Amino acid sequence: SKETLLQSYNKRLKDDIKSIMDNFTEIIKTAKIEDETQVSRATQGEQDNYEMHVRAANIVRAGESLMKLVSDLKQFLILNDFPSVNEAIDQ
Amino acid sequence: LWPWDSVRNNLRSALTEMCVLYDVLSIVRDKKFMTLDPVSQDALPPKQNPQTLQLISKKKSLAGAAQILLKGAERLTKSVTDFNSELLRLRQHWKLRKVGDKILGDLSYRSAGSLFP
Amino acid sequence: QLNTLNKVLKHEKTPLFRNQVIIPLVLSPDRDEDLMRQTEGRVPVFSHEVVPDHLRTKPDPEVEEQEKQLTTDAARIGADAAQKQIQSLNKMCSNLLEKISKEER
Amino acid sequence: LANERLRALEDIEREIGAILQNAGTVILELSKEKTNERLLDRQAAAFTASVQHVEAELSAQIRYLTQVATGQPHEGSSYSSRKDCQMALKRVDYARLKLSDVARTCEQMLEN
Numbered sequence A: 001s002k003e004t005l006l007q008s009y010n011k012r013l014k015d016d017i018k019s020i021m022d023n024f025t026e027i028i029k030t031a032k033i034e035d036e037t038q039v040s041r042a043t044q045g046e047q048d049n050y051e052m053h054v055r056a057a058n059i060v061r062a063g064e065s066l067m068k069l070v071s072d073l074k075q076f077l078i079l080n081d082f083p084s085v086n087e088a089i090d091q
Numbered sequence B: 001l002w003p004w005d006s007v008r009n010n011l012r013s014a015l016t017e018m019c020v021l022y023d024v025l026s027i028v029r030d031k032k033f034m035t036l037d038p039v040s041q042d043a044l045p046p047k048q049n050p051q052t053l054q055l056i057s058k059k060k061s062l063a064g065a066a067q068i069l070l071k072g073a074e075r076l077t078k079s080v081t082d083f084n085s086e087l088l089r090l091r092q093h094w095k096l097r098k099v100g101d102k103i104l105g106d107l108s109y110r111s112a113g114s115l116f117p
Numbered sequence C: 001q002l003n004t005l006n007k008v009l010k011h012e013k014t015p016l017f018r019n020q021v022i023i024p025l026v027l028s029p030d031r032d033e034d035l036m037r038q039t040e041g042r043v044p045v046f047s048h049e050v051v052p053d054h055l056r057t058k059p060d061p062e063v064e065e066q067e068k069q070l071t072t073d074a075a076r077i078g079a080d081a082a083q084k085q086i087q088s089l090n091k092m093c094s095n096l097l098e099k100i101s102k103e104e105r
Numbered sequence D: 001l002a003n004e005r006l007r008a009l010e011d012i013e014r015e016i017g018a019i020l021q022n023a024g025t026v027i028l029e030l031s032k033e034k035t036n037e038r039l040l041d042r043q044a045a046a047f048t049a050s051v052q053h054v055e056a057e058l059s060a061q062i063r064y065l066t067q068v069a070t071g072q073p074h075e076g077s078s079y080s081s082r083k084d085c086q087m088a089l090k091r092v093d094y095a096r097l098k099l100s101d102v103a104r105t106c107e108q109m110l111e112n
Helices: A003-029 A041-080 A082-090 B005-026 B049-080 B083-093 C002-008 C033-038 C050-054 C061-074 C082-102 D002-028 D037-066 D080-109
Strands: B034-038 B096-099 B102-105 C020-024
Touching: A003 A041, A003 C082, A003 D037, A041 A082, A041 B049, A041 B083, A041 B096, A041 C002, A041 C061, A041 D002, A041 D037, A082 B083, B005 C050, B049 C061, B049 C082, B049 D002, C082 D037, D002 D037
Parallel strands: none
Antiparallel strands: B034 C020, B096 B102
């Protein structure tokens, strides 16, 4: 049907929006600089560099997913738009 | 698999070392072959290096972060300035539909009156 | 997950692991079934090559050079800017998170 | 009609703008001298407003599609008038051919 496809588009949009927002909030979660205790400084420094790297990668992936969604919406509207089709026909 | 063998080296080597880590922990659950015994100790700090170095986590790895964010941004800003345009002109003259996942059009004079099957 | 789980299951609400004295009982110069089923197909003859392989503590030298340059970057201006910059960045970090989280209501 | 396409591509622009400005903020919050804290608030506001207006536009577009979708192939078309016009063009071409032939026979008679 058509309700399933549109609700899938809604699900994808809300999922990606909450994903990018959550990722930025966790980036600022690890952004507090504090005092260490039993954490072996260099280890968590390296793996937090690793985490922010993979999270920036997640941000880029989110942007690319939004681009794909925009392209799909562009395809969908032109093909099934009754009003747009009529104008071309009458001209 | 000639490509991605170097990553394969780094990961199988890290795998063998973390296998040795699960090995030392496998002997850590042990009271036979080895006994546990707790007594504490001390380690005086040289600096406030957690914070200091965390600030470098921002400098270094947030520079890598901001670099990759700006690198994605420059790639995209370049990219935006062709398929979906051509579909317009085609849909403006001919007659199209989408069924399944492909795009199909018609040629026959069939909506215009013919019944030639 | 694996990082954050292990990191919080270590540095909060724990008896302290950095106490333990590590003192095995004997040397097992022979192939024990204890090893092969305790460890799932590994652990060759426990010997003077794998006593230190087990109980090695010195890391690779690259991080040692990193620690040398940690001493170097501590040799720059300090004792007036370490705590000062912790204060400033902590405060404005907190302000940022407050502002961004505050407006989703 | 075309406005829909224009707004969609403008939304593309704002997507990459949000990525750029976020990268800018995180440039600022690593440098020791993060003096422009009013302008740090500026870049945070840019992040905020950008994300909301993007999500706003896409949600509105989905609702519009939810009111215009019917799942049928739309079997109108414009073929007949195009056949008629092609017929008329080749009729004119016939005329042009016969005229040239008459022209040459008159041309050859006038010349002795």
